[PDB]
Amino acid sequence: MFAKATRNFLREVDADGDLIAVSNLNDSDKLQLLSLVTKKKRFWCWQRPKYQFLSLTLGDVLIEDQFPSPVVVESDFVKYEGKFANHVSGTLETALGKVKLNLGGSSRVESQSSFGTLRKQEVDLQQLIRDSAERTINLRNPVLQQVLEGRNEVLCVLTQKITTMQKCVISEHMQVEEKCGGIVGIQTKTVQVSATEDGNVTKDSNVVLEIPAATTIAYGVIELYVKLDGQFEFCLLRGKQGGFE
């Protein structure tokens, strides 16, 4: 599965977590260099921030000043090869008075993630700061209003991107076995009762799916400092990028 394949990848290559794995193939054709994304900070450290991509780009939202030509540099690294055989078995057995419950769930996932030569396309960070420090982004736009209403989510702009060049292989084997068993005995008045329910579910998903070249594997964004007064700056440090009123 594509979601697990890039998650495991970025785990073993990106030790700092500054790159974000692409969720699905749907998102792999929307993420482009210097297009704007928004991460919702309402979620805590428990879950990943919710990332949503606007259809607009930087030049679509600057309006005030002209578009600075990008400095795209191509670097290849980590062609890699990943095999992941995960076995998870969890049995829950509960017995309270009348009701006895026996549950056994065995899940086996063997996700092979074979990738070719992966290339990185990073944009010049200095071009990113030059336009931002000046009055380049218009304050009011017909779109992005819903972003301000909801301070918690802030606009970001993509600057790093990892893209594959060779047809990739994701051979996913997912064997799921779940056994549910319930024995119920009720001591009713003048009625002897005996109810037993047994549920056995065995599911197999042998899915070998290929991945085309030029797909997006990972992307890094740096956040946009937004003050409703109208002052904006694309800053890469934790100091002032959270959004302010």
Place this chain on the structure above:
Amino acid sequence: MFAKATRNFLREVDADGDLIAVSNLNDSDKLQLLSLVTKKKRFWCWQRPKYQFLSLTLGDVLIEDQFPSPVVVESDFVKYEGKFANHVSGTLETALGKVKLNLGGSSRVESQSSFGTLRKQEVDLQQLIRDSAERTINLRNPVLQQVLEGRNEVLCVLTQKITTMQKCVISEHMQVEEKCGGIVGIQTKTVQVSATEDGNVTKDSNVVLEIPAATTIAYGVIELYVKLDGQFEFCLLRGKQGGFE
């Protein structure tokens, strides 16, 4: 079965659920780029929203202003291959006083979903917003009145579409075995009664059906913000697309 085949597909490829699987072959010839659909929000998160397709398109309902030529871009990905062997067995045994009931139901489904090179045809999101932000859609139409009467369901427009290029194979094997047994004994006055009913049902459906090329596999829509005042905007974020009075 076609409904299960694309459901499993989008499950393993579309991790975010922004794409919707096509229910049947009937719907596979109605879904086209930029045709309007309506999702009924009356259902909760428990069931999927009810999606119904209007025969009209955007240009059929704009009327006020001219049709913006689409930006259709073709991308292929996830040619894929899916094998799904699912075994479900559930036995219910109930005994209350006179009536004893033994039920055993075994269901086996082996649905192979082999697909060729699947291609995506997405329309320019920026063309979608340009006409919408202007007074382009007429307020009153002879059709779509039943949509307003029923606020809950809102109009949407298709923008993403996944289409196959090679004859696809869906080899579905559905073995269903259901055994029903009831022993009933009644202690009647001066009448000794003994009633037993046994019902054994064994059903097999070995159906291998092919799927032609150019069929619709998945489609993504972005919703239309409808205010009865007459202000409309095709917005891709959760902020203002629900429909208002």
Place this chain on the structure above:
Amino acid sequence: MFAKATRNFLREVDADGDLIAVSNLNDSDKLQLLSLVTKKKRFWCWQRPKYQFLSLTLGDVLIEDQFPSPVVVESDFVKYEGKFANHVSGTLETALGKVKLNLGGSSRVESQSSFGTLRKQEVDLQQLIRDSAERTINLRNPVLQQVLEGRNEVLCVLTQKITTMQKCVISEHMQVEEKCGGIVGIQTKTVQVSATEDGNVTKDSNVVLEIPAATTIAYGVIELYVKLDGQFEFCLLRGKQGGFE
């Protein structure tokens, strides 16, 4: 994994710890000669200082005076070869009254770190001091303000760099076996209870990933003495490089 591969390397070659291992491949394309980095001194000796890289360089922040041409000298050493077979097994067994817990976790890591001829590119330390001792760095910059607000983290400039010339091999084998078992018995009033939960998790990650040439393996920085008055000096000794107000 890249983080472990250079950590083990610098451990066996750099006995004094004056060089810092590169965390991930993400950072391997950002670290360049004489670019500025910042280490956060809030952490104690327990954890390594948090190193973050600014997009700007020395010439980007001097402004006051012209850029002194670097003295880059190339030296190769420690082509090296590292094999690391680490076995970690830890079992925790706890039993308190009603609840009995048995936990067994076995982790095996076999990380082979094969590297080619590694080359060092050091900049002339005397060029580093000449500009610094003079009024060469502007006091106020639109960027780096967040660094001053947070005295604890101080700006540093990279001066030593170890770079590989041959495609490197990092064959990582990570076998993780975790077994969790809990038997729970509760002496409830008129309710005899017996709850057992068994969780077996077996995870394997056979990942053989290659490393391209020209990647950054290690980098050494010397810190920048910052006084908010405006006096700056790139000093290599512990005396005055901590940052002052």
Place this chain on the structure above:
Amino acid sequence: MFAKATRNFLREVDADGDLIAVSNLNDSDKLQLLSLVTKKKRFWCWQRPKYQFLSLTLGDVLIEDQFPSPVVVESDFVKYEGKFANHVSGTLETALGKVKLNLGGSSRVESQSSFGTLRKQEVDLQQLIRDSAERTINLRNPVLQQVLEGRNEVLCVLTQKITTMQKCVISEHMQVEEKCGGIVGIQTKTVQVSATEDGNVTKDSNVVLEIPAATTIAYGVIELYVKLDGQFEFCLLRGKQGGFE
């Protein structure tokens, strides 16, 4: 490991300890003839003096008078060959009341230190004394202030250097086995407790790394008599080289 390799070397060749082993490859490219180093005398005879190298040289700090041309003489000796198979096993077993602790640690190190023809490059001691006895070193420098603040550490100048001419071999085998076992039994009120923790760690580091030619293996310094009045003399005897106020 390089630190152990030259330590063992100088132990068997340098019986008097007047030469100091190079800590790491990092320091092997910084140590040059007649460059200045500083040893911190705060540490007692228990630990070696802390040696730190200034980026400056003699001619960089003389200023007052001109640089006396060196008398470098090349002599080769002790091509040598060292094999070191060290086995260390230490088991600690402690039992106090409730807590019983069994610990067993076995460490095996087989460090082969094969070196080629090693050459010595000594500078004329008489050239060293001629400039020093005269007013040749300026009293105040922008650098070295932190050395005076901290009398304890004094400036020294390198005069002896041992350098290899052939690619050297350091085949290090480090097998580390550590077994930790703790049985804990607590006689709590109305709660019978039994906690057992077992930790087995097995680590192997089979590292065969080569060493290039021209690397620094050993270096000898003679200290600089520093009086804050301004009188300096490079003296080789214990009499007056400690630094004075």
